[PDB]
Amino acid sequence: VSPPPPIADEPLTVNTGIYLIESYSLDDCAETFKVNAFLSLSWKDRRLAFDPVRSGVRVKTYEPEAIWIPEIRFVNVENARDADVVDISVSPDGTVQYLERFSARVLSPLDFRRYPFDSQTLHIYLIVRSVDTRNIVLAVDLEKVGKNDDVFLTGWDIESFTAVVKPANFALEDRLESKLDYQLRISRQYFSYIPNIILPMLFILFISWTAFWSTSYEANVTLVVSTLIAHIAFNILVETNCPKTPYMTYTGAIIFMIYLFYFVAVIEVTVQHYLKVESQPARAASITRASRIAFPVVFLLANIILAFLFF
Amino acid sequence: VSPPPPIADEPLTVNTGIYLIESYSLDDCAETFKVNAFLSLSWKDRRLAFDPVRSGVRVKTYEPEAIWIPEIRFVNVENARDADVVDISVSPDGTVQYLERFSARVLSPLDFRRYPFDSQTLHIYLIVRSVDTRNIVLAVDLEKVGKNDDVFLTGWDIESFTAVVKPANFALEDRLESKLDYQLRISRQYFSYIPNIILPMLFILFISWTAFWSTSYEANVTLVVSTLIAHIAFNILVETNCPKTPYMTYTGAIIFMIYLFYFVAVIEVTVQHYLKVESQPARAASITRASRIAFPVVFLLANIILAFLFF
Amino acid sequence: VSPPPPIADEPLTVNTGIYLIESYSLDDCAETFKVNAFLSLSWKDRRLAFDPVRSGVRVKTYEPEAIWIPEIRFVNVENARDADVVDISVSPDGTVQYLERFSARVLSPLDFRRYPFDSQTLHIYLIVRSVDTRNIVLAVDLEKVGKNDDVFLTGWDIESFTAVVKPANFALEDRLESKLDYQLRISRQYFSYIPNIILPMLFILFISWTAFWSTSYEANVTLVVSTLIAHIAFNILVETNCPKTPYMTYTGAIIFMIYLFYFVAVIEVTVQHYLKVESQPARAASITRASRIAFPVVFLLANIILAFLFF
Amino acid sequence: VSPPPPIADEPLTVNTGIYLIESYSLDDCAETFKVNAFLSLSWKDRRLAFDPVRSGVRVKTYEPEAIWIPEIRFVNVENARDADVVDISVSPDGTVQYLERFSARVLSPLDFRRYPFDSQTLHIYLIVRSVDTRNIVLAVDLEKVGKNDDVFLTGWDIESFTAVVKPANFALEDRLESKLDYQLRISRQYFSYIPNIILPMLFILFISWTAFWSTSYEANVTLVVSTLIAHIAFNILVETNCPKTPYMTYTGAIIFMIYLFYFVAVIEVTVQHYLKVESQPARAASITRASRIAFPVVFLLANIILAFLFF
Amino acid sequence: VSPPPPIADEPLTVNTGIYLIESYSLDDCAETFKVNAFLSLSWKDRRLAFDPVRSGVRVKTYEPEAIWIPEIRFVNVENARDADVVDISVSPDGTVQYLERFSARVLSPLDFRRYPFDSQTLHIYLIVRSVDTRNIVLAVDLEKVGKNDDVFLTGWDIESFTAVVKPANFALEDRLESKLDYQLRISRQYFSYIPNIILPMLFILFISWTAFWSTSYEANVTLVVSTLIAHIAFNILVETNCPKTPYMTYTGAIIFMIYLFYFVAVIEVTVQHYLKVESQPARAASITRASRIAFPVVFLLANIILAFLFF
């Protein structure tokens, strides 16, 4: 139980691969996702080499304790992987074929700027710290990287499970460290978003705009203010349950603009009344009449500006 | 501790059986359910065979470490099953009778399209990866598949516990994998749904429709808008608190239609007043009178269309 | 480590016992209660017999690994018991005296039909699967059953901790299984219930009835509708946090009836106004005057009907 | 190994103590608190006694496996303590000095009757079950009982960590049990309660009382009812998140009283209008004028009665 | 497995270092943060020293069980560290180079007085208890104290990861303790705070101030009270979810002042009406006109006072 010696002065290349079995619990708030997968490792340890003629066997099976296995760890895991060795197979030349089944809650940041049209790239970082005896470098076996066809994330389109084939080798505390990036690309499945979140919220803003075809200040205060309460209550109903993102989101910008529209509508309603009370019903009625077109138009344009601005 | 050798080139047939002891924690949000059950495994290892005359014993009991046991794993489990071996029995011919008790949170998707009248089929996938020495294939022992009569899920009718007898054998990473599906069929209990969710939500809506027997715009704005707030508060009140399904549900469609009805009712109330203010009380009163029948009728039909459309 | 042999063809009687140390985490939603307790087990393994003269000890203490212990398991536990062996003592005859401190989240259904006046019987099921060598049957040593006086459940009166002395012996997967029932009887502590839940909700409904001493439709719409919003907001404030029980509860029936009363009150208010607007202030005022008595009376009787109906 | 033998017929006295290192996660709802602390155990085992002259060492260090250690357990812990042995030191006379570092979630009831001015006594119960060979009794070593100066609980003043020096020795299942009570006294930091909870809630109440300087029934219904909604919404905003305490709290009594005041205020507003409509504006105006003083006075007195009643 | 002996009467110096790999789950409510990092320990054990000539090896690798490793523990961790030894290397002189990978939820208080402009210093306390044989003192190896560049906390600026080089040596339960302070500095990066929390909350407040350009008491009651409900509902929407901080926060002071402004605005509205009803429309209109400037000015100044007062 010591690393295999180098033929020359070459480092030990370990052939990695992750095959996704199950993907679940994608926590948008915590920026985590639980994955249940296979981990395939391969390296050549000539100390384990055998003659298939003399041995009379094609490949020999070993116990993890019996042979030297590289210390492969994950970088962005919450709690260390629940490892279960499935099989260890040494071919006659000494090439070890290691396979384990694991499950891990992965920490991977998410960008909600383009939400709910957002797409995400989920990372799984593999790492190996080079020993005293020799240096270890990770490699990707593209045949052993993939995902089950049943692999799902509710509300997401699982685009691809790939791996940046070139490791990021670097020095950490006077030792070499070889890091591999495994990427899971997903795009949001948002059709229910329009009837469930946008349209209802829109009718609410629209009900406020009916105050442009009314002269009763009592009815108009009730119109714009009550729809504001209705809007806040509606947003309480839908609400994401995630702490505010430090950055400004697309949906967040629209919501901000909606609060601004309720404020401006109150200004109009207030002005309309003050002009009417200050015996200027020419200006009072003209503003109201303008707003009837101004509010829907400006809203429509301001959303076009934002949509363009974010996408 | 190596697989039993084949008589000829035949694969190892492992006879399974899952007997449900307890079923609990069905998370509609997470699409999981925890299950407490028995796992019965059986295979013939002639290396372990004996003469009952010479041995003087009926059946010999072994420790898991002592004999070769196939690596049976579950496909759709969150964290690897809490396994406890109950008994291992080897009959004189070498037939191993393995039984373990386990508990695992099983990831199984749910279809809420027909909610709350929905029925679900819960999957438990058994799998075995074929070794170098020989190929392993799973089989179902229908005598050892069942469930306790005490097995319950609050709010569900546990219909059946059945098993797809024919395994799905396939190749994965150059090795054969035999997969079995165990189905748990459940149907929802929607007794309380009508008085707890549907009826109060309908009363709130009907309160809005009373604005068709009134000419006071102040009282009418108050009627349709306040019921809208009441409706949103009532929906906050029900609190399913499951993130919106990406897809459109039956209940979700009705709710959408309800938001639309509140909007249209505001249009009517607004129009009624504008016609009355624009000295056309013939059209004003006629629309209000029409709506008195139009709103209940269109609602009734639109729900019939949906009910039919979803069921 | 094999069962003790029978003198004649008698089964092994494992005398049991459960002594509650702590009881906590009663989750009404999950139908679970966490219990921290002692487990007392006794059987005769004559293979362990000794002469105290030759031994020099009147009783010998053993490690769990050293001797044969029955495989006792709990039926309705979420995750396998957190077992800690306190003591194993053998008397000269070979009578084993086992004691273990365990803690487990027990799954036991709850009947909320009579809530908040409901009483519950929480179950803890002990089981043992009979082996090939000999059959095992469980018994209750009534002296080693009981509960600490400090044992509490906030908001419940812990009535008793008793055992169904006669085990339920049955056949499961061709083997005998002996099951014991441990019952924990509890009754709820309502009383905060009247000032915290009923009266404030009851006041809100009476505030709606003040619309029977008013003729202003604007003030009456505001009265009955605003109290409806107040009622929903109040129920959001109290709310149980449990998903709807599939069955109709007593409290749930009252709440349903309250929603119905808000609807009927809106009908009255609407009718009163329509009669007054259709120049029939004789009928308008008579209905309002009737309601003044009708609403409180019908409510009082309808609650009496329900109280009687549920209890 | 086996307990030390008694010199005469005396029981083994175990001197126990621990200094709180960290205290965190005080869950008011669950009546639990996580504590991270030291556990110091001491007893004399003359079998381990040595001559410091012959040995040439002052104190010998042992491994837990090597010597006999008493089975000390905690009575009120959720899941069994996370024990880590720091040091075992045996003095020449045979006095063992055991010290472990542990962390455990402790179940200890809380009395919210005087909330938010409440003070609490948190219990940690130590226990030891006496063996067959000899009886074990617990003692407190006051030098080894303490709490870190850094030990904090957010929103609590950590007063004293003391221990009831005299154990509660009792018989349980025919064996002696010695129990020590360690108490953690804390007082609540209620400063932010006045500006955050009591004053905004009261401003809301007073806004309702402005209806005593108004004659408009429409404006008065709006005043008292809308402030009621505002009050419920405000209470939803502040809300503790803890299930209802079965008993009546001080804050709970005030809140009850507030709901009663909103009801009575609606009675006044209703009466005032009915008298005014019944052409009796002498009585109408007199009641309103009375209330202007009656409501603030009765409130002030009723709170004095309660404050006195609870404290 | 006993501490190395001192050359003279010197204590054993253990050179420490913590390298942050991942930082996640910063719970503002619980005052915790999970950290995934490296722990580098170094000391000289001359009992392990060797001749590189005779041995033919530069550095020898040992198993944790084989050699003596100091009992290093963390002070402020929730649950015992998830330790995994990466490498143990002994140089010819006997200098041990220990490296492990750990993950732990660290309890570290937070000061929200200056929230959301607040900055925090996160502590990680290393400790070692001095043994009987010799005294142990901790040291910082500044070369082995860093953080990964990828290390992130969403909504925070990870400024630095430093260590107080001089340990805090003290006596605890008659033994010497050496404690090291590793402090992580983070400044809250909450850009989105103004458009997401402040701006909408202010629009809501200003809507109330429009009641200064109106004489309709019905419309004015509706203005100030409804905006107050809107404000509470808005605050329910943006709710932090953390229990009230015992102390007064900056944001909390502003919110308090906002509740006070809604109260004063109701006083004005009430007074304005009473003066108008008591035939004094000179004073009524003058106060309303004053308020138009008084309310915005006093608000602006009062916020300047607070901003200055807190920062």
Ligand SMILES: CCC[C@@H](C)C1(CC)C(=O)NC(=S)NC1=O
């Ligand atoms: C004319 C008073 C209407 C009133 C009940 C009003 C709207 C101003 C409403 O409709 N809803 C709510 S939640 N608050 C209010 O004050």
Ligand SMILES: CCCCCCCCCCCC
């Ligand atoms: C008219 C004001 C409506 C108030 C709605 C409040 C909803 C709060 C829900 C909070 C759930 C925890």
Ligand SMILES: [Cl-]
């Ligand atoms: Cl890991």
Ligand SMILES: [Cl-]
């Ligand atoms: Cl599994």
Ligand SMILES: [Cl-]
């Ligand atoms: Cl169990």
Ligand SMILES: [Cl-]
């Ligand atoms: Cl314990």
Ligand SMILES: [Cl-]
């Ligand atoms: Cl630690």
